[PDB]
Amino acid sequence: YEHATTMPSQAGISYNTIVNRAGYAPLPISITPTKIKLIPTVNLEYVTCHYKTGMDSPAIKCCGSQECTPTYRPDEQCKVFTGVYPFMWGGAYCFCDTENTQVSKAYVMKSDDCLADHAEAYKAHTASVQAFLNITVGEHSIVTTVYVNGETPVNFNGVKITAGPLSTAWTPFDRKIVQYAGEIYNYDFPEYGAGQPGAFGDIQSRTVSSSDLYANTNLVLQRPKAGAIHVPYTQAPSGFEQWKKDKAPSLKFTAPFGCEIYTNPIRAENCAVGSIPLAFDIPDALFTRVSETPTLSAAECTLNECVYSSDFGGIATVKYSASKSGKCAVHVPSGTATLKEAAVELTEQGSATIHFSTANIHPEFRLQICTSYVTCKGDCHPPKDHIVTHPQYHAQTFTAAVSKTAWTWLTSLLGGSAVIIIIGLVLATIVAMYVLTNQK
Amino acid sequence: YEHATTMPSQAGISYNTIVNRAGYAPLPISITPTKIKLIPTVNLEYVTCHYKTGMDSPAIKCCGSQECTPTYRPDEQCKVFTGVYPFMWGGAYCFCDTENTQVSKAYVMKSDDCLADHAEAYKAHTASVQAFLNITVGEHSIVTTVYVNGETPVNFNGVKITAGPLSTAWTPFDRKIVQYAGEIYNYDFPEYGAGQPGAFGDIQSRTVSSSDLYANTNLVLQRPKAGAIHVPYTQAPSGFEQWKKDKAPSLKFTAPFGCEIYTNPIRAENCAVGSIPLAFDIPDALFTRVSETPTLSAAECTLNECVYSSDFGGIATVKYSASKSGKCAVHVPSGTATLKEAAVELTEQGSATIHFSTANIHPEFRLQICTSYVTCKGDCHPPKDHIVTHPQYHAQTFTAAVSKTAWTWLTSLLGGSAVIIIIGLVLATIVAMYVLTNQK
Ligand SMILES: *[C@@H]1O[C@H](CO)[C@@H](O)[C@H](O)[C@H]1NC(C)=O
Ligand SMILES: *[C@@H]1O[C@H](CO)[C@@H](O)[C@H](O)[C@H]1NC(C)=O
Incomplete structure (x- = not known):
C-alpha cells in the first residue's frame, strides 16, 4: 500500500494521520x-x-x-x-x-x-x-x-x-x-x-x-x-x-x-517554512482484519467545553459501546480540529475522553473512531490569555471564525438583497402579462 | 579603461586581440x-x-x-x-x-x-x-x-x-x-x-x-x-x-x-563547448602615445599564396615604409581571417610576412597594422588532404564558401528575374496611361 501525506515543517509538533483500507482495520501513523x-x-x-x-x-x-x-x-x-x-x-x-x-x-x-x-x-x-x-x-x-x-x-x-x-x-x-x-x-x-x-x-x-x-x-x-x-x-x-x-x-x-x-x-x-511531503510504503502484512480490532457501535460525541486557544483547549467525551476492549485509533479527517492523541484505550461500555485543538467558534467535525464516524458539534469561547509562548497547534481557514451571528447578519442581508430583486422581477413579469392581456 | 571580449573554450588555440585607444598606441592581448x-x-x-x-x-x-x-x-x-x-x-x-x-x-x-x-x-x-x-x-x-x-x-x-x-x-x-x-x-x-x-x-x-x-x-x-x-x-x-x-x-x-x-x-x-567572457581592467599607465610606437605609412597587402585549410594555410606580405624600427601589432578585426601572430618587427623600409588562416575562397580581409590599415585581397585554392589531425583554427560564415561564379549566377537569376518583372510593370503602366489618354 502506497500512502502520501504532507507534514508541515514545524519542529516539536506531532503530526497524526490514519490509513484506512476499504475493509481492514485503520492504521495510525505519527511523525514527530x-x-x-x-x-x-x-x-x-x-x-x-x-x-x-x-x-x-x-x-x-x-x-x-x-x-x-x-x-x-x-x-x-x-x-x-x-x-x-x-x-x-x-x-x-x-x-x-x-x-x-x-x-x-x-x-x-x-x-x-x-x-x-x-x-x-x-x-x-x-x-x-x-x-x-x-x-x-x-x-x-x-x-x-x-x-x-x-x-x-x-x-x-x-x-x-x-x-x-x-x-x-x-x-x-x-x-x-x-x-x-x-x-x-x-x-x-x-x-x-x-x-x-x-x-x-x-x-x-x-x-x-x-x-x-x-x-x-x-x-x-x-x-x-x-x-x-x-x-x-x-x-x-x-x-x-x-x-x-x-x-x-x-x-x-x-x-x-x-x-x-x-x-x-x-x-x-x-x-x-514550507512543508515536507511524506511517502509511506506499507506492506500488506501490517493491515490486520476488522474483527481483530474493536468494532464500535452506538457512539455519540459530546463537547464538554471548547476554547479555541493555540494549545489543546477543547475536550470531548464519546459515549461508546464497543465489541471488545483494546487500542483504538481516533482521527479527524477534516482540518477543523487536531486531536492530541491518535489512539485511545477502549472498553466494552463507557465514555472516552479526547483532547483536541480547534480554531472554530462553532466546531462541526466528523471524528473517526475504530470504524464509526461520529459528528461532533458545539460552541467555543475565546481564551483567557492574550499572548502565549508556544506555536499554534492547528490550522485555520478563512471561514473558521465566522460565528452563527455573522452568518445570520450576512445571509439575511445578502438573501434579502436577492429576495427583493426576485419580487421586483416577478411583479414586472406579472404586469407585463397583464398589459399584453389588455390588448383587446 | 575596461575591455570586454569573449574567447572560444578551445584548449590550445591562442586568442589574439588588439585594444585601440583614441590617440594612444594599440595594445595587444594574447590568451592561450x-x-x-x-x-x-x-x-x-x-x-x-x-x-x-x-x-x-x-x-x-x-x-x-x-x-x-x-x-x-x-x-x-x-x-x-x-x-x-x-x-x-x-x-x-x-x-x-x-x-x-x-x-x-x-x-x-x-x-x-x-x-x-x-x-x-x-x-x-x-x-x-x-x-x-x-x-x-x-x-x-x-x-x-x-x-x-x-x-x-x-x-x-x-x-x-x-x-x-x-x-x-x-x-x-x-x-x-x-x-x-x-x-x-x-x-x-x-x-x-x-x-x-x-x-x-x-x-x-x-x-x-x-x-x-x-x-x-x-x-x-x-x-x-x-x-x-x-x-x-x-x-x-x-x-x-x-x-x-x-x-x-x-x-x-x-x-x-x-x-x-x-x-x-x-x-x-x-x-x-561554450565560450568564456573576458573583462580586462587595464590601468591607464600602460597605454603609450603613437609617437613612441613605430608609426607606419604607405603600405599594401599582396596575397602570396592562400589555401583555406584548417591550419595557417595563407601567407601574405605587406610592403611597409615605417618611420622607425620596432615592435608593431597586427590583427584582423573581422572573423574572415585569423593571424598566426599578434606582433611583427618592422624596419625602416621593407616587407613583412604574415601567416593567416581563412575559410573563404576569396579573402577580402581588413588587416590592421599597429598604425596603418590595409585591405588585403586575393584568391584561395582547396587543400590537398581530406582529413587532418588539427581542429579548425578559423571561424567560418554561412556565405564564406560562395565563389565569384556562384555570386554571378545568383545575382543573374535573382535580380534579372526582378528586372523582367520591373519591365512588365513599366509596360503595364505605360499602356494604362496610353489607353486612359485615348478617352477622346
Ligand atoms: C520521540 O523521540 C524523541 C526523542 O527520544 C522524544 O523527545 C519524543 O517525545 C518522542 N515522541 C514520541 C511520540 O514517542
Ligand atoms: C604559455 O605557457 C605554457 C606553459 O608554459 C606554454 O606551453 C605556452 O606555449 C605559452 N604560450 C605562449 C603564447 O607563450
Whole structure:
C-alpha cells in the first residue's frame, strides 16, 4: 500500500494521520519532528585576521650609499633615505655629517593570534535538508535521521518512508557568508586577491596554515626623525578590527522564519517554512482484519467545553459501546480540529475522553473512531490569555471564525438583497402579462 | 579603461586581440588556454565491493534442542535444523540417533580487498569551471589558473582580468555517478538502504572505513546434507561483479564534446563547448602615445599564396615604409581571417610576412597594422588532404564558401528575374496611361 501525506515543517509538533483500507482495520501513523536541519554546501574561500607589520631592522651605511632589494614579502615596502645622523644611547652613531644612508623595510604578516582569532569566508549553495523524526506506524516505532531529499528512504519493519523534497528552496544564507567566533554573518566579502585597505579581507590567506598571504594595507614609509633609529610607516588601520567595530547582528538574530544558526557544520535549524511531503510504503502484512480490532457501535460525541486557544483547549467525551476492549485509533479527517492523541484505550461500555485543538467558534467535525464516524458539534469561547509562548497547534481557514451571528447578519442581508430583486422581477413579469392581456 | 571580449573554450588555440585607444598606441592581448577543467561538486554516500558470506561454525547438540540467537550482523540469519547426525573424521559425532539439533547462522561482510577493489557512488552537481591561461598584454606575460566564475580576478602588473561565467551550464556528469578504477560512469545506482540483491549496491557501506554495512543478498540457509558438518546457504551472486561484467564504457569514451574525464578530483577537461567572457581592467599607465610606437605609412597587402585549410594555410606580405624600427601589432578585426601572430618587427623600409588562416575562397580581409590599415585581397585554392589531425583554427560564415561564379549566377537569376518583372510593370503602366489618354 502506497500512502502520501504532507507534514508541515514545524519542529516539536506531532503530526497524526490514519490509513484506512476499504475493509481492514485503520492504521495510525505519527511523525514527530524533533529537529529539522538545513546544511548548505560551503567551501572555504580564505581566512582573515588582524595583521602585524613586521618590519626589518634599519640598515645604516656610513659615508656611503645603499641599494634596495625586493625580498618578495607580502605588501613589502623598501626605501633608502639619504642624509641621516642616527644617535644611539652611546652618542652619535655615524662619523659623516651627510651622505649617510639608512635603508628601511616594512612588510606585513598574520598576527600571532591568527590561529584563534580569525574569520573564515565561505561560499554557500545547494542547501541540503535533514530531519530528526520519531516515527510510529502501527505500534512500530523508530527514531532516526532522514534526509529530506524526496528519494532517500528510511526503512523499518518492512515499511519504507521517503521524506521531502522541501516545498521551498529558501535558505537563510546568501551566496557569501562570513563565520567569526562561531557565529555566521551574511557578508559580501571581497574575492581572494581583491581585498582593499581598511576593510574586511585586507589581508587574505587561503587557509589558516597556508603559506601564501595576499596583503593590501596601503603601507607606505616615512622619513625617519632626525637623530633617531626607527622605521616610521603609515598604513590604513586593520580591516578586521574595523569590520568587527560595525558588523550588524548575525543570522542568529536576523534570519527569517526564526531559524537557529549553528556552526560546525554551518547549518540552520527549526526554520518554520514550507512543508515536507511524506511517502509511506506499507506492506500488506501490517493491515490486520476488522474483527481483530474493536468494532464500535452506538457512539455519540459530546463537547464538554471548547476554547479555541493555540494549545489543546477543547475536550470531548464519546459515549461508546464497543465489541471488545483494546487500542483504538481516533482521527479527524477534516482540518477543523487536531486531536492530541491518535489512539485511545477502549472498553466494552463507557465514555472516552479526547483532547483536541480547534480554531472554530462553532466546531462541526466528523471524528473517526475504530470504524464509526461520529459528528461532533458545539460552541467555543475565546481564551483567557492574550499572548502565549508556544506555536499554534492547528490550522485555520478563512471561514473558521465566522460565528452563527455573522452568518445570520450576512445571509439575511445578502438573501434579502436577492429576495427583493426576485419580487421586483416577478411583479414586472406579472404586469407585463397583464398589459399584453389588455390588448383587446 | 575596461575591455570586454569573449574567447572560444578551445584548449590550445591562442586568442589574439588588439585594444585601440583614441590617440594612444594599440595594445595587444594574447590568451592561450592550455587546459580547461570542469569540476563538479561530489558527495559520497556509499561504496560497494564484493561481499564475503561469513558463517559461524555450527553448534551441534546431541539429544537436545537449541534456540536462535537474535540477529545483530548485516543480513545475519540463523536456523536450527533438528534430526541431524553429524559425522566427523573420527566417526559419528553424536551417539544419539535423532533429536540432535544443529544451529547454523550466516551473515555478510565486506571482502578483504574492499580497500582497493571498490566503487564509490557520488552525487554530482554545480560544476565549477576552471582554466589554465597563459596571458600576455603589453609584452608582460603571466601563466596562471583562472576560476571561470564571473567574479574572481587575477592581478598582474596592475591589470585586472576576470573570466567567465561560462556561456553554457552543460556538464557531462549526471546527477548520480560511480567512480571505479579511475573511471567515471553515469549510473543511476540505488541509494543507501535501498540496495537490491544481485545488482550494484547490494551491500552498501557509508565509507570505506565505516563500521556500518547494509546488506541485501537473499541469503537463505538450507538444510545440511546428512552426516555432514557444514553450513549450506544460498544467495544471489554478487551485484558488484555483475555490474563489472556489463557496465558500458565509462564517460571517458562516451562524453559529448570530446571531454576527457579524470579522477582525483573528478573532473572533465578540454570540452569544446561554450565560450568564456573576458573583462580586462587595464590601468591607464600602460597605454603609450603613437609617437613612441613605430608609426607606419604607405603600405599594401599582396596575397602570396592562400589555401583555406584548417591550419595557417595563407601567407601574405605587406610592403611597409615605417618611420622607425620596432615592435608593431597586427590583427584582423573581422572573423574572415585569423593571424598566426599578434606582433611583427618592422624596419625602416621593407616587407613583412604574415601567416593567416581563412575559410573563404576569396579573402577580402581588413588587416590592421599597429598604425596603418590595409585591405588585403586575393584568391584561395582547396587543400590537398581530406582529413587532418588539427581542429579548425578559423571561424567560418554561412556565405564564406560562395565563389565569384556562384555570386554571378545568383545575382543573374535573382535580380534579372526582378528586372523582367520591373519591365512588365513599366509596360503595364505605360499602356494604362496610353489607353486612359485615348478617352477622346
Ligand atoms: C520521540 O523521540 C524523541 C526523542 O527520544 C522524544 O523527545 C519524543 O517525545 C518522542 N515522541 C514520541 C511520540 O514517542
Ligand atoms: C604559455 O605557457 C605554457 C606553459 O608554459 C606554454 O606551453 C605556452 O606555449 C605559452 N604560450 C605562449 C603564447 O607563450
